[PDB]
Design an enzyme around this catalytic site. Structure first.
Site, PDB file in Angstrom:
ATOM      1  N   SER A 166       0.803  -1.217   0.000  1.00  0.00           N
ATOM      2  CA  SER A 166       0.000   0.000   0.000  1.00  0.00           C
ATOM      3  C   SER A 166       0.841   1.274   0.000  1.00  0.00           C
ATOM      4  O   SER A 166       0.305   2.348  -0.283  1.00  0.00           O
ATOM      5  CB  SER A 166      -0.946  -0.020   1.199  1.00  0.00           C
ATOM      6  OG  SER A 166      -1.465  -1.335   1.365  1.00  0.00           O
ATOM      7  N   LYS A 176       0.926   3.814  -2.991  1.00  0.00           N
ATOM      8  CA  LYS A 176       0.053   4.976  -3.165  1.00  0.00           C
ATOM      9  C   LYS A 176       0.822   6.289  -3.117  1.00  0.00           C
ATOM     10  O   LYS A 176       0.352   7.292  -3.668  1.00  0.00           O
ATOM     11  CB  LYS A 176      -1.041   4.976  -2.102  1.00  0.00           C
ATOM     12  CG  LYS A 176      -2.019   3.818  -2.240  1.00  0.00           C
ATOM     13  CD  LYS A 176      -3.174   3.905  -1.236  1.00  0.00           C
ATOM     14  CE  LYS A 176      -4.100   2.697  -1.403  1.00  0.00           C
ATOM     15  NZ  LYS A 176      -3.500   1.426  -0.882  1.00  0.00           N
ATOM     16  N   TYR A 184     -10.666   4.271   3.418  1.00  0.00           N
ATOM     17  CA  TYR A 184      -9.453   3.863   2.724  1.00  0.00           C
ATOM     18  C   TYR A 184      -9.796   2.832   1.653  1.00  0.00           C
ATOM     19  O   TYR A 184     -10.485   1.849   1.935  1.00  0.00           O
ATOM     20  CB  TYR A 184      -8.466   3.286   3.745  1.00  0.00           C
ATOM     21  CG  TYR A 184      -7.082   2.997   3.199  1.00  0.00           C
ATOM     22  CD1 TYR A 184      -6.264   4.028   2.745  1.00  0.00           C
ATOM     23  CD2 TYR A 184      -6.585   1.701   3.181  1.00  0.00           C
ATOM     24  CE1 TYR A 184      -5.006   3.780   2.265  1.00  0.00           C
ATOM     25  CE2 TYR A 184      -5.314   1.437   2.687  1.00  0.00           C
ATOM     26  CZ  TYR A 184      -4.535   2.481   2.236  1.00  0.00           C
ATOM     27  OH  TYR A 184      -3.271   2.250   1.759  1.00  0.00           O
ATOM     28  N   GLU A 225      -0.036  10.408   5.038  1.00  0.00           N
ATOM     29  CA  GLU A 225      -0.772  10.867   6.214  1.00  0.00           C
ATOM     30  C   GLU A 225       0.075  11.901   6.942  1.00  0.00           C
ATOM     31  O   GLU A 225       1.290  11.736   7.079  1.00  0.00           O
ATOM     32  CB  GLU A 225      -1.095   9.692   7.144  1.00  0.00           C
ATOM     33  CG  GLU A 225      -1.989   8.692   6.448  1.00  0.00           C
ATOM     34  CD  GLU A 225      -2.043   7.353   7.135  1.00  0.00           C
ATOM     35  OE1 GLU A 225      -1.373   7.154   8.170  1.00  0.00           O
ATOM     36  OE2 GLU A 225      -2.791   6.487   6.635  1.00  0.00           O
ATOM     37  N   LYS A 239       3.464   6.583   6.235  1.00  0.00           N
ATOM     38  CA  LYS A 239       2.570   5.670   5.524  1.00  0.00           C
ATOM     39  C   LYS A 239       2.992   4.244   5.828  1.00  0.00           C
ATOM     40  O   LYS A 239       4.181   3.923   5.722  1.00  0.00           O
ATOM     41  CB  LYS A 239       2.617   5.909   4.001  1.00  0.00           C
ATOM     42  CG  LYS A 239       1.663   5.022   3.204  1.00  0.00           C
ATOM     43  CD  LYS A 239       0.187   5.469   3.383  1.00  0.00           C
ATOM     44  CE  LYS A 239      -0.770   4.688   2.462  1.00  0.00           C
ATOM     45  NZ  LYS A 239      -1.332   3.513   3.174  1.00  0.00           N
ATOM     46  N   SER A 244       1.330  -3.013   3.177  1.00  0.00           N
ATOM     47  CA  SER A 244       1.713  -4.411   3.100  1.00  0.00           C
ATOM     48  C   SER A 244       1.153  -5.030   1.828  1.00  0.00           C
ATOM     49  O   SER A 244       0.299  -4.457   1.149  1.00  0.00           O
ATOM     50  CB  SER A 244       1.190  -5.209   4.309  1.00  0.00           C
ATOM     51  OG  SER A 244       1.577  -4.596   5.530  1.00  0.00           O
TER      52      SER A 244
HETATM   53  C1  LIG Z   1      -2.728  -1.881   1.722  1.00  0.00           C
HETATM   54  O1  LIG Z   1      -3.015  -1.157   0.768  1.00  0.00           O
HETATM   55  C2  LIG Z   1      -3.009  -3.365   1.698  1.00  0.00           C
HETATM   56  C3  LIG Z   1      -3.443  -3.843   3.075  1.00  0.00           C
HETATM   57  N1  LIG Z   1      -2.597  -3.320   4.122  1.00  0.00           N
HETATM   58  C4  LIG Z   1      -2.430  -4.223   5.070  1.00  0.00           C
HETATM   59  C5  LIG Z   1      -1.730  -3.921   6.309  1.00  0.00           C
HETATM   60  O2  LIG Z   1      -1.970  -4.610   7.324  1.00  0.00           O
HETATM   61  O3  LIG Z   1      -0.922  -2.961   6.316  1.00  0.00           O
HETATM   62  C6  LIG Z   1      -2.964  -5.392   4.728  1.00  0.00           C
HETATM   63  S1  LIG Z   1      -3.113  -6.722   5.739  1.00  0.00           S
HETATM   64  C7  LIG Z   1      -4.364  -7.903   5.327  1.00  0.00           C
HETATM   65  C8  LIG Z   1      -3.966  -8.720   4.100  1.00  0.00           C
HETATM   66  N2  LIG Z   1      -5.159  -8.774   3.281  1.00  0.00           N
HETATM   67  C9  LIG Z   1      -6.303  -8.155   3.922  1.00  0.00           C
HETATM   68  C10 LIG Z   1      -7.239  -7.398   3.022  1.00  0.00           C
HETATM   69  O4  LIG Z   1      -6.890  -6.973   1.927  1.00  0.00           O
HETATM   70  N3  LIG Z   1      -8.455  -7.246   3.547  1.00  0.00           N
HETATM   71  C11 LIG Z   1      -9.591  -7.175   2.818  1.00  0.00           C
HETATM   72  C12 LIG Z   1     -10.596  -6.308   3.233  1.00  0.00           C
HETATM   73  C13 LIG Z   1     -11.780  -6.208   2.517  1.00  0.00           C
HETATM   74  C14 LIG Z   1     -11.959  -7.004   1.392  1.00  0.00           C
HETATM   75  C15 LIG Z   1     -10.967  -7.883   0.976  1.00  0.00           C
HETATM   76  C16 LIG Z   1     -11.195  -8.721  -0.248  1.00  0.00           C
HETATM   77  O5  LIG Z   1     -12.370  -8.863  -0.669  1.00  0.00           O
HETATM   78  O6  LIG Z   1     -10.208  -9.244  -0.820  1.00  0.00           O
HETATM   79  C17 LIG Z   1      -9.777  -7.972   1.694  1.00  0.00           C
HETATM   80  C18 LIG Z   1      -5.721  -7.271   5.021  1.00  0.00           C
HETATM   81  C19 LIG Z   1      -3.385  -5.355   3.299  1.00  0.00           C
HETATM   82  C20 LIG Z   1      -2.294  -6.066   2.509  1.00  0.00           C
HETATM   83  C21 LIG Z   1      -4.125  -3.662   0.710  1.00  0.00           C
HETATM   84  C22 LIG Z   1      -5.432  -3.008   1.141  1.00  0.00           C
HETATM   85  O7  LIG Z   1      -3.721  -3.190  -0.569  1.00  0.00           O
END
Ligand SMILES: *C(=O)[C@@H]([C@@H]1NC(C(=O)O)=C(S[C@@H]2CN[C@H](C(=O)Nc3cccc(C(=O)O)c3)C2)[C@@H]1C)[C@@H](C)O
Length: 357
Positions: A64, A67, A150, A270, A310, A313
């Site tokens: 992320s 961004k 977000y 942020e 920021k 992951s």
């Molecule tokens: C950041 O942009 C990235 C997300 N950030 C983090 C983090 O903890 O920093 C995660 S962790 C975890 C891994 N996958 C999950 C997720 O994407 N949740 C989610 C929420 C709602 C819908 C779905 C779906 O339908 O796939 C998934 C959170 C995560 C990598 C992502 C947002 O790109």
């Protein structure tokens, strides 16, 4: 090594190194830049099966944190007159003209306030054709502009529009224009075959190597090295040293656009009043802020003294970046396994509060 080299090494060994054993993270890179001097620290393995150690050439997925580059690209296009932040996406993606999403402006897309875009696309949106269909079929929910949620789809659409305004695909916007303007040498949307030996493996919670969705690049699709990320922090600390077009782009990403509790949403970054309490920095990554809509409030006057960070992951990489203009200092953490965001924020808070001026 210089006394500063040894001091920073001790602080990173004290605050970041224990996290490798604690969370079974194969490899980590931590960088500090202070007064235009860069300090690189590497621990562990880029690939467990190859026993290849993390080094200055190791490429990590920024997740992320990507961004921030989308934000810089948008600031670049806006300050070259290619877009206005008051434009709507159908001005550029003509198939969205006269649809409800054409009532949301580009700043609202970039800062997650459309009022009906969640963290991810629906699971059934898997192709570029289906992304366009999704945005044509979109209807508003909460008052446009008023609630932050977000959202990868939101800033993905912003990135797609930025690319259209520059008459090149988004990957080329970054690899041909933005990364070169920032002086980055090994930052990629698509890692070439000639670099695959440097491309770290990411590790899931079972410590297995895995290896995206559509319109993903502007939201989570950038890869980079620790030296390049320190260069990116240098650019954010010293935009006046860079040529006008990227200087204006960088400055654009530092401008707070609205407030949510103690956090100011800038472009990508942020923003917080400096000093930020540790709790303020932790709150920015609470479930309430990250997963739910929150009402925005307009900024009276931007904070007199500011800092920025920021988190980001993928399922198998972790990233954190933070910088403090007044102290001419910043820090970057890259890992090839996720660790809790609170651990990244606490470790960087400890280091930046302890380093001698
Ligand atoms: C950041 O942009 C990235 C997300 N950030 C983090 C983090 O903890 O920093 C995660 S962790 C975890 C891994 N996958 C999950 C997720 O994407 N949740 C989610 C929420 C709602 C819908 C779905 C779906 O339908 O796939 C998934 C959170 C995560 C990598 C992502 C947002 O790109």
């Amino acid at each position: 090594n210089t006394p500063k080299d040894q001091e920073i090494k001790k602080l990173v060994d004290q605050n970041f190194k224990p996290l490798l054993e604690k969370y079974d993270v194969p490899g980590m890179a931590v960088g500090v830049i202070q007064n235009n001097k860069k300090y690189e620290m590497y621990y562990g393995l880029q690939s467990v099966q190859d026993k290849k150690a993390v080094n200055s050439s190791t490429i990590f997925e920024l997740g992320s944190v990507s961004k921030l580059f989308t934000a810089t690209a948008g600031g670049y296009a806006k300050n070259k007159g290619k877009i206005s932040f008051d434009d709507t996406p159908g001005k550029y993606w003509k198939e969205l003209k006269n649809t409800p999403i054409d009532q949301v402006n580009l700043l609202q897309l970039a800062t997650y306030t459309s009022g009906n875009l969640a963290l991810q696309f629906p699971d059934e949106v898997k192709t570029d054709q289906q992304v366009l269909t999704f945005f044509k079929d979109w209807k508003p929910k909460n008052s446009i502009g008023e609630y932050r949620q977000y959202s990868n789809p939101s800033i993905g659409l912003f990135g797609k529009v930025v690319a259209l305004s520059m008459n090149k695909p988004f990957d080329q916007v970054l690899e041909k224009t933005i990364f070169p303007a920032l002086g980055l040498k090994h930052s990629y949307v698509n890692v070439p075959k000639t670099q695959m030996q440097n491309y770290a493996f990411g590790y899931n919670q079972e410590n297995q190597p895995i290896r995206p969705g559509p319109l993903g690049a502007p939201a989570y699709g950038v890869k980079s090295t620790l030296p390049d990320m320190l260069s990116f922090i240098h650019a954010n600390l010293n935009p006046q040293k860079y040529p006008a077009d990227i200087q204006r782009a960088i400055n654009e990403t530092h401008q707070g656009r609205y407030q949510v509790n103690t956090m100011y949403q800038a472009l990508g970054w942020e923003e917080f009043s400096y000093p930020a309490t540790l709790q303020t920095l932790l709150d920015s990554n609470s479930e309430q802020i990250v997963m739910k809509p929150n009402k925005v409030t307009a900024i009276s006057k931007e904070p007199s003294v500011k800092m920025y960070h920021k988190t980001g992951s993928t399922n198998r990489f972790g990233t954190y970046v933070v910088f403090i203009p007044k102290e001419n200092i910043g820090l970057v953490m890259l890992t090839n396994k996720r660790i809790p965001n609170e651990e990244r924020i606490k470790a960087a808070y400890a280091v930046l509060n302890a380093i001698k001026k």
